[PDB]
Ligand binder design. Structure first.
Ligand SMILES: Nc1ncnc2c1ncn2[C@@H]1O[C@H](COP(=O)(O)OP(=O)(O)OP(=O)(O)O)[C@@H](O)[C@H]1O
Ligand SMILES: Nc1ncnc2c1ncn2[C@@H]1O[C@H](COP(=O)(O)OP(=O)(O)OP(=O)(O)O)[C@@H](O)[C@H]1O
Ligand SMILES: Nc1ncnc2c1ncn2[C@@H]1O[C@H](COP(=O)(O)OP(=O)(O)OP(=O)(O)O)[C@@H](O)[C@H]1O
Ligand SMILES: Nc1ncnc2c1ncn2[C@@H]1O[C@H](COP(=O)(O)OP(=O)(O)OP(=O)(O)O)[C@@H](O)[C@H]1O
Ligand SMILES: Nc1ncnc2c1ncn2[C@@H]1O[C@H](COP(=O)(O)OP(=O)(O)OP(=O)(O)O)[C@@H](O)[C@H]1O
Ligand SMILES: Nc1ncnc2c1ncn2[C@@H]1O[C@H](COP(=O)(O)OP(=O)(O)OP(=O)(O)O)[C@@H](O)[C@H]1O
Ligand SMILES: Nc1ncnc2c1ncn2[C@@H]1O[C@H](COP(=O)(O)OP(=O)(O)OP(=O)(O)O)[C@@H](O)[C@H]1O
Ligand SMILES: Nc1ncnc2c1ncn2[C@@H]1O[C@H](COP(=O)(O)OP(=O)(O)OP(=O)(O)O)[C@@H](O)[C@H]1O
Ligand SMILES: [Tl+]
Ligand SMILES: [Tl+]
Ligand SMILES: [Tl+]
Ligand SMILES: [Tl+]
Lengths: 217, 217, 217, 217, 217, 217, 217, 217
């Protein structure tokens, strides 16, 4: 009976609701706009036109029965703050709120939001990382110094090997997976071959990976 | 270094500009809102007020001299499409546009945009995956079936060494890194232990990682 | 069962719909404005209030059954582009779209519009031709050099003949029809007479016709 | 040369101004929108920002010195009517106004406009005639019953000479010109042949031309 | 069966309708505003919410049955012109239209309005006449030189007579009525007495009356 | 001469200002609309742009120096009331305000306005009286029962002398003046005749004048 | 059957209505906004959506039966003036109106409002008094010179007495009540003790109390 | 003296500023409306136009140098909250904010506002208490049960001495002061008399004061 409410159907909120309902979960789409409700109705377990700033409508949805509530309102700062304050004063266990600027994050922190999300800023940082380094496809920072990076193998790495491309001693990183033509190899053996336009999953220090990219690739 | 031009300062494009200049690149912050230009003036090389949909203002910016142009406008579909068409007529090597819906992405496809980004949608998918599983902190999908996952250790995981939790054979997964008290052990040994409320990096097929989440932690 | 849909009731679109329904054809008038629908209802086979940007309403009209669809929306550029993209992605054979500027024409070209029309620009060119040359009433350009021109015969041509006004040798043109008091003569004999304020249909090079106008008329 | 004044730069009036100056005439581009004046400044002799409905601004323009004044305003009915009345009070020899509906045309009639144009309506009639008959490319109506038509040749017409297709006696029409590969044969001979996807100019009564379209091609 | 229609309920139009219905006449109040119709309903024989610019609604009121129609719309110039043109083209015998400026009067003249009224301008002239001459209460100009004037008798005229105040020879005017305490005397005898604050009805040349006011009063 | 200040240039107040300056008085044209100030600048002594509801701007105008202040604002009830209150606080001898409805007149009464004018209402009463009786041209009501009336002569009145139409005894009225072909006979003799389409001035009780209109003409 | 009407639900008006209905009185909440009526419905004896500027709706509420009527409209000056004038002309005994500025107070005075209230100005004065004097909690001015003041006893007054803190002779004031930990003592005996952070109710001249605060506290 | 900064000039904050400067303090009048800054410029030391929600403008004002900051904005909830958060981040010792509703007060609580004021609510409570009891003029509540009350004397109270009205024993209350004809007797004697229409200060429990109001007056 785990329940998720998504207040504020937008790109972020609509994506959250659609992805949660695709997973086989109970989601209630809530938006003050009738058209947004009609849009995301077929992608949720329930869809109600409600003004989340209103305590009466909030109670009428059965908001108390939801373990998780996600306020994806990000453009209207005062509406998002009102919804978050109402949800806290109604004792919702987990409130995840989308922020707009740093002060919105501060005021959502002070009123007790469980998690505050900055989607656009994070994706902008990631896309900038992919912009300066045209090799990287995706990545994940384990810490401020260590990261796992997926990379497009260049012509310089075409038909090379795991011992021919030695990184555990020449650059300090290790190689974790290789994707060729759609088939993936995990924990690759020292004999495995990397080809041009393959996907390489390296892991180590940021500067180590960049050393490998400048010198190796 | 590299010639970047971020048209459309916003939460996404502004983050791109800020991070790319912290990276030390020539980033031209283009906006029509004077307050937007002033907000990111301290973070860019040149911050010019201009309407990108105007050909005269675009030639005034010298936008043909830039190798990378990023149209982060995603709310004004017409303005974004017009700017992308103007840049494609100007033979820009790389055009990266932010899209709003499927049809905006389609019209950006037809007019020759090089890379179309949907930040809010993908980040909402990620946050929904974190909502359905409170254990996962971050992840990267190698393919539609294989992934690397960051997890938060639980009471069922405290003082459990890597040899007690055989993931190499019980689930076909591999533990990649442990993070304890801000320090990090990369490629940990079978005798290394894990304490609760730590960051655990595992690699393998999605259902196998979920199997470990269910049975082990 | 040939079917024409006219989306965007306006001067151009309303004229297209009224002229097609006068011809004894099946036309569906579609406009987002209830008043425009009520206006052009009595001049069409069917009239429905629909938002053409909406895929659901577009499917509800039975848009798939129309062989020809005419998007006469010209002022709202983004709405016209959305309607055209939807009609293409719904596999409409012939899409005829009214344009507003040269970039609207380009974006309608890139998304696959079958025909793009610039009514106002064309009629402005024609009216300018009638403005500088007060003699011409209507015309048609066969090529960039040859044209057929209807002209008001001046007093200088009153009670003149086809051999008295020789143009097949004196100016290189030929005379094709003469309209006197409402009666018309085609392929006129060499003995036919032109009178003042008659309609003369000459045909030949533009400069040849202008020679005849300066010298003959 | 000739004194023209295009009040109301738009798709229609702007085309008039552009073409008339490519023709090399003194064309005064009058508009109230500064951006409209700047858009057509490179194509006119003088492009002044002015409100035509104001008598003081109209005397400032020296509009009484112009033989031809064209009020292309068709969306603001009141402004167009007021401008036409102001010009008629100023004894302008030729006033040509763009109209929107039947009643705007009637009030332009009553206040003494010399020529009223309905561009979109007539062009929509033409495009509707081209929609009902895909063969016709352009046409000019000599009278309500007689016309000259440009047609696109079909497979039924390839390698057919002018004597095989007797239009002079079988249908009472006459072929006027053939256009093949951008070259053009004017007043073609009976032994001249026509290939498919060519431009064919025929002349005659409307029903007779349609008879040839049905039976021949 | 004499019938009056009042289109445009306002101060002027509402006053016309209320005064006509007080007289025991058939009046139809017509206004596009539901509140104005509800207001002037109880003061008319009928009240209908109608958009007079619409020919269909105009016909639905039975506008053809009205001998007199008064378009009191004065602020919306284009709406008043449209209503007047419609009423003329529907062959209304008498059309009385309220004007706003001199050009509105001209355009209503050209489209065939039977009477054009300038209420505010006329009353402003009258109030200015009462302003400069504090003696005058009301008046009526018989011609540009002769007028009948009602005046407040001053202390200088208190307890004076018709032969004591001789005006048929001393100033060229005659005295026509005297109102004392509410009782009025017409064609007053030479023995009648004027008292302070009485109402005097003099008649003659403007300069003659002003002579009498400067010298006599 | 006299110190007048017309606050609120409009159709009423603008007429007051224009006529009063044609009369040669010091008329201060006060308005908040710059175009309104410019429109009546050529007709006044001083035309200042000012907001009358502001005490500082009112003391800047030197409005305490004026003996007569006319607030012609009748659409903005609040602004007119505030201006009247500001002038009454400034001890203006004569304040004449234009009113919109009964309640605006009441609040102008309570705050001490000297004279309240309802131009449109009274002029609509006059025009309604002219509509019910096409014979009357103008009139002045001496009392609720007695009046002077200007009439248009009919066929029943042509070549009728003043002794044939005994109004002195048959109806208790008196003919005051005749107007023929722009010339005027004042206080006409019993042998003076009247032709049709002339201006006839009669004086007497309302019902008696109507009796003559019915029986004589 | 004493009855209170509250027109203008706002902070001030809503507080008046809620406090009057808490007291066990008959209150009718009246607001032109449906949401305000729904809000203050559960806190009143009746709640009706009405436009108080309308005489018909005002009569429909039964406004004649209310002995007290409170116009809490303060932002819309003209609406408040209209409501007050209507209530006076309907002979309401007691009209209490909320004012906005000094001129609104003047115009409400002139139209006969029984009481005019300036809540925000009064509370601003009180809060300024508490701002400069951080000791005072609340007070009440008996006259422009004498006042009763509640004060927070400082550390300088901790464990002091009524004869140890002598004010009837040392500063001219008297002590009236002492509040310790929630228990209050009225007309305190000469032996009573004041403690730190207690509430002291002194009474006397303003300068006397300030002497005591500077010297004693 | 003391450093005050009133952000948000309004009826409340403007009164605070005016009174505090009449008190002779350094009061910085901060507003975004230029007319608001000009309105209170004559009553403050410095009156700067600034947007308080902007960090740059706030550091430009030198707001960190002020010991007391009063955000009187109560209609714009977002702007007030943002300003309060900006000041709390700047370590202002005393922040006093004006609130609109319970939730605005709650968010001001969470972000660390020192004192939150609800002027209209409390003043409406006071005016409601004065409406239910016409005798009370002002009052101060010592506790939820004890209060000091100012009353207006009635006919039942004229010529009644303090010993005839034993409030010390009949009701447990005490008369504190009498006010007659603008003069005031403080701490009056048992033989002092009271006349009607005087100001009487009584002290005691609420129900006891009401008992005296019922039985005595
Ligand atoms: N009080 C409210 N109650 C319910 N829904 C609301 C309320 N206020 C706004 N919304 C809706 O929540 C959604 C949030 O979208 P909004 O445009 O405000 O933010 P955004 O940051 O641009 O969104 P995103 O990037 O997630 O698409 C909108 O669909 C909006 O209509
Ligand atoms: N010519 C232009 N046309 C449109 N937007 C422009 C233009 N020049 C600059 N911009 C900026 O582009 C930005 C992108 O628009 P907007 O912020 O409405 O869209 P969004 O994609 O929803 O934003 P975000 O990604 O920040 O959430 C705006 O901040 C706008 O000021
Ligand atoms: N999404 C839509 N769906 C349906 N009809 C639409 C839509 N958007 C606009 N329309 C209608 O289509 C018509 C197009 O007129 P519009 O004023 O936009 O263009 P225009 O270039 O001025 O027209 P024209 O010259 O043909 O009269 C209008 O009646 C408009 O209301
Ligand atoms: N005084 C004026 N009054 C009205 N329009 C004016 C005036 N001066 C210039 N104009 C221009 O006249 C043009 C005609 O108006 P508009 O474009 O709305 O009408 P339209 O006939 O539908 O246009 P188009 O023929 O270009 O489709 C506008 O672009 C406007 O800027
Ligand atoms: N098309 C229309 N059909 C019917 N009524 C209309 C139409 N357009 C306007 N009206 C109404 O006619 C009335 C004319 O008032 P308007 O304010 O336009 O003129 P005005 O000169 O200020 O009036 P007045 O001085 O007579 O009060 C208004 O009540 C308006 O709502
Ligand atoms: N401070 C002011 N407040 C209001 N109106 C002002 C002010 N200063 C000047 N005016 C002018 O007063 C005029 C009177 O207002 P408006 O024309 O709307 O009313 P009206 O009585 O219906 O007009 P009219 O009598 O001309 O028909 C306006 O033209 C306005 O520009
Ligand atoms: N004509 C009317 N009839 C009834 N209610 C009205 C009318 N006009 C305004 N109101 C309502 O009266 C209330 C007065 O609030 P308003 O915002 O106008 O004043 P305010 O001074 O800001 O109020 P406050 O400080 O008391 O909250 C509002 O709820 C408004 O909707
Ligand atoms: N940055 C700012 N944000 C918001 N308001 C500001 C700002 N700077 C100045 N102000 C002023 O703060 C004032 C408070 O807002 P407003 O008057 O709408 O609220 P209110 O609490 O209902 O008012 P009042 O207490 O006077 O009745 C406004 O007059 C506004 O001009
Ligand atoms: Tl966004
Ligand atoms: Tl057009
Ligand atoms: Tl008016
Ligand atoms: Tl307030």
């Amino acid at each position: 009976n785990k329940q998720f409410a998504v207040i504020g159907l937008g790109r972020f909120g609509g994506s959250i609701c659609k992805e949660l309902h695709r997973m086989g979960h109970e989601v209630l789409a809530v938006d003050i706009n009738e058209e947004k409700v009609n849009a995301y109705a077929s992608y949720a377990t329930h869809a109600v036109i409600a003004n989340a700033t209103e305590e009466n409508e909030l109670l009428s949805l059965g908001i108390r029965n939801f373990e998780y509530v996600i306020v994806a309102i990000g453009a209207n700062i005062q509406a998002s703050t009102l919804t978050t304050l109402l949800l806290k004063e109604l004792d919702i266990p987990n409130i995840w709120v989308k922020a707009q600027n740093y002060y919105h994050h501060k005021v959502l922190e002070k009123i007790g939001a469980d998690r505050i999300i900055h989607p656009e800023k994070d994706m902008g940082v990631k896309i900038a990382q992919s912009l300066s380094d045209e090799n990287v496809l995706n990545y994940i920072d384990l810490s401020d110094e260590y990261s796992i990076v997926e990379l497009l193998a260049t012509r310089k790495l075409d038909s090379k090997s795991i011992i021919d491309l030695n990184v555990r001693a020449k650059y300090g990183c290790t190689i974790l997976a290789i994707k060729h033509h759609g088939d993936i190899c995990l924990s690759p053996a020292p004999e495995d071959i990397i080809r041009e336009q393959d996907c390489l999953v390296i892991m180590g220090h940021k500067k180590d990976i960049k050393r490998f990219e400048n010198e190796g690739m």
